[PDB]
């Protein structure tokens, strides 16, 4: 169980996500039958003016 | 402008002119659209959309460059691009404040060009020059009386004492001191007038069916510009020289 | 494949009169847009065999500008699905009439 | 909605296409485009 | 004699500065969650037809209202005004054998 940063998202979401995990070595990996993650939006700037 | 700005805005500008300034054209306009033509003009109403004034101001001053002969014209659409990539990277009150005071000295330098010449003297024939451009200059069953029509037409404009011609936005207007129907569309003035050029008094089965297709409108233009005529002018034994030499001599006989 | 090129075209318009077209059309009222020729959202329900009858459903959505109804039956075993990247349940090699007409 | 078709002897699907509209673009800067998807009723957001 | 009118409050607007934007349902106001689970990416189809769970094709909609693939297409609109940040909070299972291919 992880726990990243804040890292910028984009200004819309699709409703089909591309979610491709890989190892080191640039490769799908097979072992792996369960994995889940939860995204949260919070505000880190304005793009308004000035 | 270049131009990048866009003509009839009447989805931005149909509604504050029933409420502010009560037009009475613009409601028999507003009456006539469909349903979903309606809706999108209550929004503007209530929330005014803001546009980006930056390419617009921008572009202001790359046209004065060319105007001034600085750079060629096809300059200003490489330099244009890289003017703009420079000021959505370093956007400041300060860069903001330059591109104001570099868009009040274009209208500075123009203004004092206007009043040192006084060109505005010279009001009516820039509004004039400006109408009879787009026209076709060519009609068919005519050419000598439209031809004349035009320089008769320039003639009023120097030589009435106060005519204001104005514009609206599609045409044209006119107004002189007369009181009551000063006004005079020139556009659909030449609209009526384009048949009646070659026109000949030979075939009427009852006179009528040919003045009477004169409009309102075109009628009191064949009025205003019958003093300034004479009979050196459209040629003889037609439609229109024969109303001609009937409205001067019911204008100069009224007196 | 052995080899794949991609051939564009370019129109050789004057560079005067190129720099007024690309100046006008870099604006935000002179936008592109366009409109997909059929106008339709495609949706495959299906009919089991031997049923007579089908009942589509959709709930509550804004149906503004709304423009009309089309429909017409096809085989289960000729119609592929499209987006995936190889259908292994697809083994027709006709006509398809859902992509076609 | 309640279609009734002929009983055939193989499944089959409904193309069933609702009339929709469908619109999209500007280049306010060399080498970049912003787009914008937009389409009634059925919209995409 | 001076009576003190007050202002009347302005209910600050939605569709505001911080709008997570789905259209039938009201917007928030707030910080939400949005989930990508293994779940689903069941009946959805044309985006793993065979795939592990390295690369899988999910729906972060939960809409049961308007269902099954409609859900999908539709987008979650963050603000233009706002520039945003997520976090990111994963959870993994595996098998993985000490001696493979």
Sequence with gaps: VADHGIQPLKNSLTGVQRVTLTDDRRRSCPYIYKTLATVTPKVLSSATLQ | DPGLKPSSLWTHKIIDSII?????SAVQNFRKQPLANKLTALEDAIVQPRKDTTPETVAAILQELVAMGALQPNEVGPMFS?????????????VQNNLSVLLGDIRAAQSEAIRSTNVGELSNQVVLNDFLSREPAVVPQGQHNYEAFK?????????????????????????VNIRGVNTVNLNSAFKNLKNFWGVQ?????????????????????????????????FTPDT????????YRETVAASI | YTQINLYVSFFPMNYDTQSELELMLRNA??????????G?????????????????????????????????????????????????????????????? | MQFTVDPMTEPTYLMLLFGVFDQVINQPTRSGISVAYLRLPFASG | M??????????????????????????????????????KTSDIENLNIHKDHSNFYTNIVQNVDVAPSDAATQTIKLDERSRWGGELHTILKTNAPNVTE
Excluded at chain 2, 215 to 229: D, E, G, H, I, K
Excluded at chain 3, 29 to 38: C, G, H, I, R
């Design chain 2, 20 to 24: 502010a300034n009560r037009s009475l």
């Design chain 2, 82 to 94: 890289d003017l703009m990539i420079r000021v959505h990277k370093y956007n400041s009150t300060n």
């Design chain 2, 151 to 175: 320089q008769t037409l320039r003639l009023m404009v120097n030589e009435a004492p106060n005519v204001t011609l104005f514009k609206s936005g599609p045409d044209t207007l006119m107004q």
């Design chain 2, 201 to 233: 008094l030979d075939t009427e089965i009852v006179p009528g069916s040919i003045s009477s297709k004169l409009s309102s409108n075109t009628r009191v233009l064949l009025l205003f510009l019958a003093p300034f005529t004479n009979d050196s002018t």
């Design chain 2, 239 to 246: 439609f229109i020289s024969q109303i001609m030499r009937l």
């Design chain 3, 29 to 38: 009222t002179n936008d592109q847009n366009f409109s997909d020729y059929l």
């Design chain 3, 40 to 101: 339709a959202v495609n949706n495959l329900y299906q009919i089991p065999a031997g049923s007579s009858t089908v009942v589509v459903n959709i709930p509550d959505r804004s149906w503004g500008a709304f423009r009309g109804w089309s429909f017409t039956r096809l085989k289960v075993s000729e119609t592929p699905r499209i987006g995936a990247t190889q259908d292994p349940n697809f083994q027709y090699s006709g006509s398809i009439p859902y992509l076609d007409g």
């Design chain 5, 2 to 39: 001076e009576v003190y009118v007050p202002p009347p409050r302005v209910m600050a607007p939605t569709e505001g500065r911080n709008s997570i934007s789905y259209n039938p349902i009201a917007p928030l106001q707030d910080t939400t969650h949005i989930y990508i689970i293994d779940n």
